[PDB]
Amino acid sequence: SHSPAELYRAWQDLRAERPQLRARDAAALLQVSEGELVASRVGIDAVRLRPDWAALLPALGELGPIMALTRNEHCVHERKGPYREVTVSANGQMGLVVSPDIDLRLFLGGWNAVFAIAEETARGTQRSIQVFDQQGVAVHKVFLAEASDVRAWEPLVERLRAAEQDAVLALHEPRAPAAALVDAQIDAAALREGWAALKDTHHFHALLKKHGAQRTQALRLAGGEWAERLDNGDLAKLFEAAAESGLPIMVFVGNAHCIQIHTGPVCNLKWLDDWFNVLDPEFNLHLKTTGIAELWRVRKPSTDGIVTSWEAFDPDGELIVQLFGARKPGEPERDDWRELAESFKAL
Numbered sequence: 001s002h003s004p005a006e007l008y009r010a011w012q013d014l015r016a017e018r019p020q021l022r023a024r025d026a027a028a029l030l031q032v033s034e035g036e037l038v039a040s041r042v043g044i045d046a047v048r049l050r051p052d053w054a055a056l057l058p059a060l061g062e063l064g065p066i067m068a069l070t071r072n073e074h075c076v077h078e079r080k081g082p083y084r085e086v087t088v089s090a091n092g093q094m095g096l097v098v099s100p101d102i103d104l105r106l107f108l109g110g111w112n113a114v115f116a117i118a119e120e121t122a123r124g125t126q127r128s129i130q131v132f133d134q135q136g137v138a139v140h141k142v143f144l145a146e147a148s149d150v151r152a153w154e155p156l157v158e159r160l161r162a163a164e165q166d167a168v169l170a171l172h173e174p175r176a177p178a179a180a181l182v183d184a185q186i187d188a189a190a191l192r193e194g195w196a197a198l199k200d201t202h203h204f205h206a207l208l209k210k211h212g213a214q215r216t217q218a219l220r221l222a223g224g225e226w227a228e229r230l231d232n233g234d235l236a237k238l239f240e241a242a243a244e245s246g247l248p249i250m251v252f253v254g255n256a257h258c259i260q261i262h263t264g265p266v267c268n269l270k271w272l273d274d275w276f277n278v279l280d281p282e283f284n285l286h287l288k289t290t291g292i293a294e295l296w297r298v299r300k301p302s303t304d305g306i307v308t309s310w311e312a313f314d315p316d317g318e319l320i321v322q323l324f325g326a327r328k329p330g331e332p333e334r335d336d337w338r339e340l341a342e343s344f345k346a347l
Contacts, residue, residue: 002030002032004039004040004042004167004168005040007030007032007036007037007040008040008041008044010030011026011030011037011040014026014029014030023037023038024138027136032136033132033135033136033137033169033171034132034136034137034138035112035113035132035133035136035137035138035169035171036136036168036169036171038115038117038130038132039113039115039166039167039168039169040167041115041117041167042115042165042166042167043165043167045117045118045119045120046115046116046117046118046167047115047116047118047157047161047162047165048113048114048115048116048161048162048164048165048166048167049114049115049116049129049157049160049161049162050114050160050161050162051111051112051113051114052160053088053092053095053106053108053111054088054092055159055160056114056129056160057083057086057088057095057097057106058086058088059156059159059160060083060086060129060142060156061082061083061084061086062149062152062156063082063083063142063144063148063149063152063153063156064082064147064148064149064152065080065081065082065145065147065148066080066081066082066083066102066142066143066144066145066148067079067080067142067143067145068080068081068083068102068104068140068141068142068143068260069140069141069142069143070104070139070140070141070253070254070255070258070259070260071138071253071255072253072254072255072314072318072319072320073288073291073314073320074287074288074291074292074314074320075253075285075286075287075288075291075320075321076253076284076285076286076287077251077253077260077262077284077285078283078284078285078286079101079102079103079260079262079282079283080101080145080281080282080283081099081100081101081102081282082099082101082102083097083102083142084097084099084102085097085098085099088106088108092108093107093108093109094106094107094108095107095108100263100264101282103260103261103262103263104140104258104259104260104261105254105258105259105261106140106257106258107256107257107258108257109257110133110134110139110256110257111131111133111139111257112132112133112134112136112169112170112171113131113132113169113170114129114130114131114132115129115130115132116128116129116156116157116160116161117129117130118153126143126144127143127144127148127150127153128141128142128143128144129141129142130142131258132169133256133257134171134172134174135171135172135174136169136171137255138255139255139257139258140257140258140260180214180217181212181213181217183217183220183221185212186211186212186213186217186218186221187211188221190211191207191211191213191218191221191222192221192222192223192226194207194210194211195207195218195222195226195300195301196226196301197301198300198301198302199301199302199303200302200303201300201302201307204300214317215313215317215319216294216296216313216317217317219296219298219311224346225299226298226299226300227296227297227298227299228296228297228346228347229294229295229296229346229347230295230296230297230310230344230345230346230347231295231344231345231347232289232292232293232294232295232312233289234295234310234344235276235287235289235292235295235310235312235321235323236269236271236276236287236289237344238310238323238340238341238344239266239269239276239278240269241340241343242265242266242340243265243266243267243268243269245336245340246265246267247265247325247334247336247337247340248263248264248265248325248326248334249262249263249264249265249266249323249324249325249326249337250262250263250323250324250325250326251266251278251283251285251321251322251323252321252322252323252324253285253320253321254319262283262285263326264283264326266278266280266283266285267280268280274288274289274290275287275288275289276289285321287320287321291314291320292312292313292314292320293313293314293315294312294313294315295310295311295312295313296310296311296312296313297309297310297341297342297344297346298310298311304327304329304330304331304332305332305333306333307324307333308324308325308333308337308338308341308342309322309323309324309341310322310323310341311323323341324337325337325338325341
């Protein structure tokens with residue numbers, strides 16, 4: 001099949017031929033995961049680190065301001081700031097990074113392997129920490145930038161360096177995807193009853209599971225007072241409306257293992273072909289809009305009152321991006337967000 005040497009050389013040949021090709025896409029062309037592709041760099045310009053998240057994550061704090069990158073297939077979220085304040089749960093399975101800038105929810109159980117990369121650029125070095133999941137798909141990346149404290153880099157790598165620089169990566173076949181039930185098999189009245197009774201928006205996943213519903217399926221069955229379809233193009237328009245007023249918003253972008261959040265206004269917006277982009281000094285968002293299959297306005301009750309969000313999904317029903325109004329927990333959402341989010345007409 002492939003040795004890692006062969007894979008690295010195949011990869012570099014592709015890059016010579018097509019430098020627009022990002023690692024994620026190169027891996028797919030080479031019939032491997034991005035994680036395997038990165039593992040082929042070990043001994044060249046990468047070092048394998050121990051998957052010791054409770055040691056690694058707080059240590060990223062020593063690097064000073066960084067850029068954190070979390071993405072899914074259709075949307076990329078890049079946020080600048082220091083990697084703090086980190087907390088990791090007692091059982092090691094949940095991590096949080098809480099601050100005005102870097103704002104993360106980390107689901108550590110699926111985090112498999114991590115590499116420190118120090119890549120040579122034309123008279124330069126780009127340093128990053130890159131995490132991959134049990135299928136080798138990227139989870140989360142942290143890039144050093146101009147303001148980073150490079151002095152902390154070598155000691156961090158030394159501290160966390162794995163004993164076995166293999167390099168080959170160990171992966172697992174995904175868990176059974178439960179067959180989805182058809183809408184008619186869901187108890188719509190009970191789901192609607194529980195939806196109306198929601199007390200905490202964090203309790204929403206449990207509600208879906210209680211009734212065996214997929215997320216878009218629940219939205220279809222919830223009724224218009226709770227959830228309505230929107231024209232897919234309205235998402236970009238809401239961003240444009242939000243930039244005009246300077247309204248603070250929250251932008252959530254995640255995958256199965258990591259969710260990254262921006263809180264604040266958005267300012268500089270740009271279309272380039274089907275890419276819709278936020279291009280602000282501390283936050284970049286890159287959204288491949290043709291990847292949006294469905295867009296929903298969603299209303300959920302809670303102890304703090306109704307919370308209104310917009311939720312965009314791909315055609316596999318997975319979330320691309322979610323928008324909320326800025327609010328501190330315990331607060332109601334702001335009227336200006338609620339108006340904006342309601343201002344677009346349902347399908």
